[PDB]
Amino acid sequence: GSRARVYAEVNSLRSREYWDYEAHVPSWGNQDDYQLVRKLGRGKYSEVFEAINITNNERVVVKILKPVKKKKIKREVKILENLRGGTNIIKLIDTVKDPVSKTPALVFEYINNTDFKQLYQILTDFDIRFYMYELLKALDYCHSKGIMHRDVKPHNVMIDHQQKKLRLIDWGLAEFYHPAQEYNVRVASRYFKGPELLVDYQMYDYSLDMWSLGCMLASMIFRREPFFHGQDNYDQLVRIAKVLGTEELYGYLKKYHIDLDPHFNDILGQHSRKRWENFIHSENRHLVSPEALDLLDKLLRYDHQQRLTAKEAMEHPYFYPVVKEQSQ
Numbered sequence: 001g002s003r004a005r006v007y008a009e010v011n012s013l014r015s016r017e018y019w020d021y022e023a024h025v026p027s028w029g030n031q032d033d034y035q036l037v038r039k040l041g042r043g044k045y046s047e048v049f050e051a052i053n054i055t056n057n058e059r060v061v062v063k064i065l066k067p068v069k070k071k072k073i074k075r076e077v078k079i080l081e082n083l084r085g086g087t088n089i090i091k092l093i094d095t096v097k098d099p100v101s102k103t104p105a106l107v108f109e110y111i112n113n114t115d116f117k118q119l120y121q122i123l124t125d126f127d128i129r130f131y132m133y134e135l136l137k138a139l140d141y142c143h144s145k146g147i148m149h150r151d152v153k154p155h156n157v158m159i160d161h162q163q164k165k166l167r168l169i170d171w172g173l174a175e176f177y178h179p180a181q182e183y184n185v186r187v188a189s190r191y192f193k194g195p196e197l198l199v200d201y202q203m204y205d206y207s208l209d210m211w212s213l214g215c216m217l218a219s220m221i222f223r224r225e226p227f228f229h230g231q232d233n234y235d236q237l238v239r240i241a242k243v244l245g246t247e248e249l250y251g252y253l254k255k256y257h258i259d260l261d262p263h264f265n266d267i268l269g270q271h272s273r274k275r276w277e278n279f280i281h282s283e284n285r286h287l288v289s290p291e292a293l294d295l296l297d298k299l300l301r302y303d304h305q306q307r308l309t310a311k312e313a314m315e316h317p318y319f320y321p322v323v324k325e326q327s328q
């Protein structure tokens with residue numbers, strides 16, 4: 001019976017065409033205008049290349065979509081359309097097809113990013129505040145647009161640390177939020193899955209993304225990446241419970257009438273809730289402050305309803321130094 005505290009009805013207040021992505025008819029341009037220069041990587045249903053638009057010499061990336069996944073292609077395309085111009089959202093430049101095979105591809109702006117494993121060990125206190133604030137702008141925007149990203153993780157938060165640019169990428173798992181809708185829990189990377197996913201609670205909302213963001217914040221301020229390093233989905237919840245506590249987990253389950261898979265009985269143990277200060281030591285103390293811990297404590301909560309919204313997080317004192325610099 002759970003619903004989002006913010007933007008709950010926003011899709012129902014829009015035209016059906018906004019959210020009815022199965023009815024969306026993309027305009028497919030011609031991929032022949034793009035020259036592929038380098039393969040960047042591959043996902044389950046996609047492959048990304050650096051490319052040049054031969055008509056204007058612009059560097060872009062091209063994400064070729066395994067064509068069988070028709071509904072999921074329309075979903076990602078419609079979501080990106082709806083997010084057009086959103087702050088710190090990766091810009092979709094065009095939707096194209098190989099004109100012979102008809103295989104579809106998405107063309108995005110190119111971001112010259114610093115890979116996160118290297119970047120996160122050199123961030124300053126101000127840097128973390130700045131980049132988290134910029135990521136929150138993207139999440140507040142997509143949530144306000146009725147969309148849950150559902151795959152927030154370091155790889156999907158591209159950061160150009162020279163130009164101070166951030167983009168939230170890979171909307172392939174994103175979905176429209178509708179009150180009382182039950183969603184597939186097989187979303188997000190293991191380390192970024194909220195407890196709701198790990199306990200099979202399907203009536204989740206935008207607040208899933210705020211758990212994932214909290215995991216990223218913890219990894220940055222404490223220099224433990226990923227912060228909750230489970231070996232599988234069961235162990236992931238155990239790792240969370242060793243920090244947030246087991247009695248606190250059971251109170252969450254009871255509130256939402258959540259059934260707990262009995263395999264957990266043999267592995268959860270009994271764990272006190274830990275103080276966040278327990279994670280401080282000489283290597284991270286310059287990144288941790290009372291305001292960072294207060295914010296983190298309000299994000300990494302079992303109860304998805306009680307987590308801060310992206311807006312509430314942006315309003316937190318931890319970001320005041322960023323707001324002050326962005327106005328002065």
Ligand SMILES: O=C(O)c1ccc2c(c1)nc(Nc1cccc(Cl)c1)c1ccncc12
Nearest residue numbers: 040041042048061108109110111169170171
């Ligand atoms: O899916 C998107 O929305 C998406 C959108 C933009 C980028 C992307 C994925 N992946 C990139 N790089 C990358 C690096 C390693 C593996 C893979 Cl598969 C991709 C990349 C690089 C530079 N500029 C934009 C992007």
Ligand SMILES: [Cl-]
Nearest residue numbers: 175182183184
């Ligand atoms: Cl779903």
Ligand SMILES: [Cl-]
Nearest residue numbers: 227239242243
């Ligand atoms: Cl721990």
